[PDB]
Amino acid sequence: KETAAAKFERQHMDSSTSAASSSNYCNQMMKSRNLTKDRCKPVNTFVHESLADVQAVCSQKNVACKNGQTNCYQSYSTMSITDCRETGSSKYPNCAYKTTQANKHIIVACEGNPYVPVHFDASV
Incomplete structure (x- = not known):
């Protein structure tokens, strides 16, 4: 299969770019x-920061998730996104x-051992 952590990386991570390319990027x-x-x-x-910086969000500002769960975290600093x-x-x-x-603050849901991002909730 594909783990929830691996699925987050495939759907939401793109560290290769500093900020998205063309109008054809998406x-x-x-x-x-x-x-x-x-x-x-x-x-x-898609988040343009390093995996280490995005994984670090799981130890940041604890906020409520859109669905009502308590495992969502907001980044303290703004991140380059698309x-x-x-x-x-x-x-x-x-x-x-x-x-x-x-360039907005990201909100991700974290789960597991190690505690890693598994869902992108919002951008504020």
Whole structure:
């Protein structure tokens, strides 16, 4: 299978870039990371910081998760991120996305031993 920690890395981590490339970034990345295989995923966020910095968020500001659980953490410093959102002309298998770069605080849900990120909750 694929672990929850590995799934977080595939869906939300992109340390290779300092800040997202083109307006075509999300179109390429959502396809490359297998997020458009079964269905075009409505929304997704990629984090451009190192894995160590994102994993460190699990020891940061404890906040409530959107679903009501208590295992969500907010980053103290702002992080370089990219928001991908599905357009209107987007029809499966040709999924089209809008690329938006930003520097916001990230909120992730952490689980396991070691305590690592498993879900991206929000960006504030």
